[PDB]
Symmetry: D2
Subunit: 282 residues, 4 copies
């Protein structure tokens, strides 16, 4: 059994299973609008780890949330904990990419008794917003909810065109990465494929974490952390982020590659696996 | 000859119940009630306010409104979105808010977020929510996540006598008159095997995953651009809180203090009339 | 001291609305209304039946009851299950049914299927549904499947004026009085941008995928074990289908022929009283 | 490029899972499995049907497809509507059906109801459902309603060991190869606290409220207009029964008895090859 559907009280999620059942327990969390194939190159190279590569709600093959429910960062965090519950995992590790790393950091700072270590790829904290702009940000979220019903779903008469659309998407990623994502990310429609998604995933949060919030979460992490930063990712590029990371104990490894370096090619996957295999052996 | 007084309002994600008061051509007002109450909170006040077309709305998970779908939250800004979608479904572009306790807090959030939509605020014994600072936010998220994991299917209290259901509501919150409790019970009880239960959603007991900071709350109140009339109960808590008074002296809101408890507009005809005098004059101009 | 008259009844799969009539300790009766009507169908009749505890239920997708979840059907046995679950949720082991039109049909199905639970049947101008034999069944299923594919494209009329919503109900279906249409409108209208719509589920227009055959219907009628009182409107069912008269002659139901239309119990006080006299004597035995 | 093998198919009311086999330009076929099985039922068979574009569908409630919403039924004609909607979502107007057991019964209902849509039926060890006559229908509805009430108290079994769940598949109704059980278990088992559980919806155990009569079932089989290839197991009840043998000689369906059990296309590679041969020819004509 390597592809399972996990039933939570409120939602059903899909996950792809890697590694030996006696392996160290890991939940692998992907980035915004991706799916579990984000780890298709990396997970097989991490021997000794039992890796549950989860599709977040509204992504890959996991269910969309019920009517009215939100896609906030801590909704994902709850879902992950309930996945751990269904597996019998009391302490487990998190391997996260981008948004998945942000969710992992929130979980580790909120529930340090549950999280054994963090392996993070080019993600750490969310975009923040301060109290002075909060009334305005809530108005924007409420107005976008009203407009949500009239929200676009693109269609692609043919496979490689959908792949190509993803190569030019949120960030730059290799054709093979896009192909790997597409195998879990496309659903058939009349007249071809669309990228399975939930329009609500484009809604702005009604309440952003303030910088102090984000800082208190990273400061609340109690387990070891290995943070891979892509040289051509804009995380490593931001100067404020370099300053923040120097104040933190997290283990940093800069590696050549883009935001999706673990997926773009076998060389990036192998480079990332080296760092994390060593991390987990300790 | 007969007029429509009780309706379902269909929103895209949920169906809510509402009682309609006043002339179809009256000034448009949505009335929002307190936590674990329902639209009967306005059963004495709304009839006393002539010239107003008042939609007294049951919040999700209260009164006769639907419970939210599985996995959905009961955060303050979820109610705020529901209220705005009600105004859309009614075809209302600009409207006023009449709010009691939690309903007042929701009204402030809406007015501060969307000043172009809210004409005025009439607030009863409520203004800003309890707040939480960033240094405690990790601990509060963990408590919120733990409570979610622990939430269970349990038989809420059952009362074989209606009298006893009413009495259980008097023991609750602060002080509330027997008449107020009975009015709330008419819309707040559901039949179950062997009696009545106070209809509720278990998720309403869960703590927020992320509270507003004191600075968030201040920014929302300082962002309200429309006229505001705030009534404080003399035997409630807000009228005695000195931090509350210091805040109000920095704000342009009209303030009135009236005798009675936290439900003064519901306890008796006199308090209902006392609040109506303040709101009728405010809405008249 | 105030009594509870309007409630939500929570079933495992749906939440229904009901109006409560009579003393809490009266004989238990669930009152079931006609297709596209609501509990106000019993607004004149139920108050006249002293000593009966009547739960006037809104069927799913009608009045103020919730619409069924996505993909669920509105077949006659679906309503029967709901009614059985309503009795469970009220704690009622044995109970009687008071049914009008479609609601009478559902009552007969329930009485025939679970005779152990049903003490008495009071039926107003309804008995069996329209039937279909096996030779048209593949055709009818194809037509039901096609209607399901085409259902996305359904919309409900909007009435800017309340009077216009009422008059739309007098023309629609059979002939009912202006007062009847007003009474049903009090519980059947919801507000929408620029006016009112008769609250309804578009699935209610779908044709059944499998109609009961004539033998099914007659077996259900024959399977009723309890005393039955049937009211026959002079201008209702029998005027529409005089073939029924010979069936009725082979059944042990008590029959009362009364003037008026299909909604004789709601059209006016004269019909309400006459039906009430018949049912009040029936329920006393 | 890599190819898309596993997909979700979004219908208006439910989201299903499917595995895609074969050349994207091949003959359009939807493959339908048996009660409590899943798309792995076609794991051996579909790879051997070259030239065919086979959508191996998980029925609602089975495998990796969503469960139906609260209150929705799992009746034969609900599956049939889902299959039609899958075809629409795929942009298929005319298509073939490959069905095992329950899936074959669904396919016959579809062909009989919409002959203009179904190119060919390839049926494995199924044809019509168990029927029931009108004189038993009140009692059968009663049993279905009672089962709906009792379903509350059920909890699904939990196997601490993978294997006890697999070999739990072999026990009960049906004889089936261990390879068959493990193949089905790959898509039909889910991890839970305590071990694994079979993913199928507990409501799948509910008896139908209304069976087709013999006449209905005959009218459907006799309404099928397209070519039909039916494979019967010699080790199955369908082939041996005389009333069934008599019916088949009256029907213009290509018929082949093959050695093997009810799941002969899945028990072993030899059985799969055998069925492949018959169907591969049938689809070439």
């Amino acid at each position: 059994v390597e592809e399972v559907r996990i039933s939570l009280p409120h939602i059903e999620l899909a996950a792809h299973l890697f590694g030996p059942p006696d392996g160290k327990p890991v939940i692998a969390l992907h980035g915004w609008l991706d799916n579990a194939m984000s780890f298709s190159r990396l997970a097989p190279k991490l021997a000794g780890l039992r890796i549950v590569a989860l599709d977040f709600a509204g992504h890959g093959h996991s269910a969309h949330r019920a009517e009215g429910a939100s896609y906030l960062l801590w909704d994902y965090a709850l879902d992950v904990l309930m996945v751990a519950e269904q597996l019998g995992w009391e302490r487990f590790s998190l391997l996260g990419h981008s948004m998945g790393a942000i969710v992992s950091v929130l979980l580790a700072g909120a529930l340090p008794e549950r999280i054994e270590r963090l392996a993070l790829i080019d993600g750490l904290i969310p975009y923040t917003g301060e109290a002075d702009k909060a009334p305005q940000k809530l108005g924007e979220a409420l107005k976008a909810q009203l407009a949500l019903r009239h929200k676009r779903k693109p269609v692609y008469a043919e496979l490689e065109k959908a792949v190509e659309a993803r190569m030019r998407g949120v960030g730059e990623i290799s054709r093979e990465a896009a192909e790997l994502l597409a195998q879990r990310g496309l659903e058939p429609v009349p007249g071809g494929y669309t990228w399975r998604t939930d329009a609500r995933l484009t809604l702005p949060s009604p309440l952003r974490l303030t910088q102090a919030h984000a800082l208190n979460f990273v400061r609340s992490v109690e387990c070891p952390v290995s943070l891979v930063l892509a040289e051509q990712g804009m995380l490593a590029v931001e100067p404020r982020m370099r300053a923040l990371l120097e104040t933190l104990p997290f283990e940093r490894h800069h590696l050549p590659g883009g935001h999706h370096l673990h997926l773009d090619d076998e060389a990036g996957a192998q480079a990332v696996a080296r760092v994390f295999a060593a991390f987990f052996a300790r």
